[PDB]
């Protein structure tokens, strides 16, 4: 089947809307909760991916838009 | 051909580097992306996009997980999800979570249809009929048939988890028993993989869609099992390694105003 574009875009649009909304907080919208670092000046930091938590819950839709080829 | 589907589930990602490299995102924690895979016909690929979406997390993404396991996989839907063989609780939890994730992606999306189980009775009867015996049958499986390949990975940490709480291979034998109990309770491939051992996760999925795959537990590192390896008699009798016979409890039991006022009162 050479129609791997229209159906992929429709299922993507469904998955894009179902991917750009990771509950906005989900009580844990990141890799994990706050934890302890190893050896640096960030013992009471937010997380190792606080700015990337946005990239994670946002990246779901980005991963769908990029891998929505076929 | 067109694009098929498989919904591999990984709880919030949590290091899918080795497990994903052994089989095939926006970040390390994106959430229900659309990954893929493909099958063959002895020479090359024939547009058979038998996608295996390794959804590393599903934060409020039930629709994305359902879109991943599309309805186009009626002829072949074998979800091969990653797991953690460090303990028996994680192995049994990941296998039951794989079957429940396939059922969740189906039932959370197929609420309108109902004759699917009716057609699945005859189709899966003709399919699993020639795949039930030769476990190296009659196993108490679920209400219907959802092929969920429980790929038990991370058995390199099984030794650390087995020595930190048992100082021997007791937790390893417990993980083997967890895979065997979930297999007899579901009827699938409890293929486990350790450090450089039994790299056959999609092998059972390919042999039971419409390469090699071993099955042994004597090495006490990776209790591999094929799609049909399901029994509860000899494995249940030998399940007494640091536990009882036919146990499942291991999974559940293992998963300056006041200052000025004070100065004034002190001066009195």
UniProtKB/Swiss-Prot annotation, chain A:
Disorder noted: Charcot-Marie-Tooth disease, axonal, type 2O: An axonal form of Charcot-Marie-Tooth disease, a disorder of the peripheral nervous system, characterized by progressive weakness and atrophy, initially of the peroneal muscles and later of the distal muscles of the arms. Charcot-Marie-Tooth disease is classified in two main groups on the basis of electrophysiologic properties and histopathology: primary peripheral demyelinating neuropathies (designated CMT1 when they are dominantly inherited) and primary peripheral axonal neuropathies (CMT2).
Gene: DYNC1H1
Domain of life: Eukaryota
Subcellular location: Cytoplasm, Cytoskeleton
Subunit record text: Homodimer. The cytoplasmic dynein 1 complex consists of two catalytic heavy chains (HCs) and a number of non-catalytic subunits presented by intermediate chains (ICs), light intermediate chains (LICs) and light chains (LCs); the composition seems to vary in respect to the IC, LIC and LC composition. The heavy chain homodimer serves as a scaffold for the probable homodimeric assembly of the respective non-catalytic subunits. The ICs and LICs bind directly to the HC dimer and dynein LCs assemble on the IC dimer. Interacts with DYNC1LI1; DYNC1LI1 and DYNC1LI2 bind mutually exclusive to DYNC1H1.
Domain notes: Dynein heavy chains probably consist of an N-terminal stem (which binds cargo and interacts with other dynein components), and the head or motor domain. The motor contains six tandemly-linked AAA domains in the head, which form a ring. A stalk-like structure (formed by two of the coiled coil domains) protrudes between AAA 4 and AAA 5 and terminates in a microtubule-binding site. A seventh domain may also contribute to this ring; it is not clear whether the N-terminus or the C-terminus forms this extra domain.
Biological function: Cytoplasmic dynein 1 acts as a motor for the intracellular retrograde motility of vesicles and organelles along microtubules. Dynein has ATPase activity; the force-producing power stroke is thought to occur on release of ADP. Plays a role in mitotic spindle assembly and metaphase plate congression.
Protein name, entry field: Cytoplasmic dynein 1 heavy chain 1
UniProt family annotation: Belongs to the dynein heavy chain family.
Curated annotation (Swiss-Prot), chain B:
High-level lineage: Eukaryota, Metazoa, Chordata, Craniata, Vertebrata
Function description: Acts as one of several non-catalytic accessory components of the cytoplasmic dynein 1 complex that are thought to be involved in linking dynein to cargos and to adapter proteins that regulate dynein function. Cytoplasmic dynein 1 acts as a motor for the intracellular retrograde motility of vesicles and organelles along microtubules. May play a role in binding dynein to membranous organelles or chromosomes.
Primary location recorded for the protein, binned into one broad class: cytoplasm
Residues of the full protein shown: 52 to 373 of 492
Superkingdom, natural source: Eukaryota
Species this chain originates from: Homo sapiens (Human)
Binding positions (ATP): 10-17
Keyword Cytoplasm part of the UniProt annotation: yes
Keywords assigned by UniProt, alphabetized: ATP-binding, Cytoplasm, Cytoskeleton, Dynein, Methylation, Microtubule, Motor protein, Nucleotide-binding, Phosphoprotein, Transport
The protein's name in its UniProt record: Cytoplasmic dynein 1 light intermediate chain 2
Quaternary structure (record): Homodimer. The cytoplasmic dynein 1 complex consists of two catalytic heavy chains (HCs) and a number of non-catalytic subunits presented by intermediate chains (ICs), light intermediate chains (LICs) and light chains (LCs); the composition seems to vary in respect to the IC, LIC and LC composition. The heavy chain homodimer serves as a scaffold for the probable homodimeric assembly of the respective non-catalytic subunits. The ICs and LICs bind directly to the HC dimer and the LCs assemble on the IC dimer. Interacts with DYNC1H1; DYNC1LI1 and DYNC1LI2 bind mutually exclusive to DYNC1H.
GO molecular function, one term: identical protein binding
Family label: Belongs to the dynein light intermediate chain family.
Gene Ontology biological-process entries: cellular response to nerve growth factor stimulus; centrosome localization; microtubule cytoskeleton organization; microtubule-based movement
Localization annotation: Cytoplasm, Cytoskeleton
GO cellular component, one term: membrane
């Amino acid at each position: 089947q050479e129609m791997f574009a229209w159906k992929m875009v429709v299922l993507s649009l469904p998955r894009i809307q179902s991917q750009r909304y990771q509950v906005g907080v989900h009580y844990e919208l990141t890799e994990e909760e706050k934890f302890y670092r190893n050896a640096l000046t960030r013992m009471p930091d937010g997380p190792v991916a606080l700015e990337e938590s946005y990239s994670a819950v946002m990246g779901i839709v980005s991963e769908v838009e990029q891998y929505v080829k076929v | 051909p067109s694009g098929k589907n498989i919904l591999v589930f990984g709880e919030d990602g949590s290091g899918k580097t080795t497990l994903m490299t052994k089989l095939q995102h926006g970040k390390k924690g994106r959430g229900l992306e659309y990954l893929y895979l493909s099958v063959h016909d002895e020479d090359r690929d024939d547009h058979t996009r038998c996608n295996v979406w390794i959804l590393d997390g599903d934060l409020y993404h039930k629709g994305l997980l359902k879109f991943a396991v599309s309805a186009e996989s009626l002829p072949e839907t074998l979800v091969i999800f990653v797991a953690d063989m460090s303990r028996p609780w994680t192995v049994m939890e990941s296998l039951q979570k794989w079957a429940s994730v396939l059922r969740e992606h189906i039932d959370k999306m197929k609420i309108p249809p109902e004759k699917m189980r009716e057609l699945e009775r005859k189709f899966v009867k003709d399919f699993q009929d020639y795949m039930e015996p030769e476990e190296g049958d009659n196993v108490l499986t679920h209400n219907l048939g959802i092929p969920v390949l429980v790929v038990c990975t991370k058995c390199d940490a099984v030794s650390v988890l087995e020595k930190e709480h048992d100082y021997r291979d007791e937790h390893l034998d417990f993980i083997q028993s967890h895979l065997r109990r979930f297999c007899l309770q579901y009827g699938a491939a409890l293929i486990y993989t350790s450090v450089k051992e039994e790299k056959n996760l999609d092998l059972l999925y390919k042999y039971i869609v419409h390469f090699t795959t071993p099955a042994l537990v004597v090495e006490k590192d990776a209790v591999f099992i094929p799609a049909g390896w399901d029994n509860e008699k000899k494995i249940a009798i030998l399940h007494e390694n640091f536990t009882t016979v036919k146990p499942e409890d291991a999974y559940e039991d293992f998963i300056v105003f006041l200052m000025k006022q004070q100065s004034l009162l002190a001066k009195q």
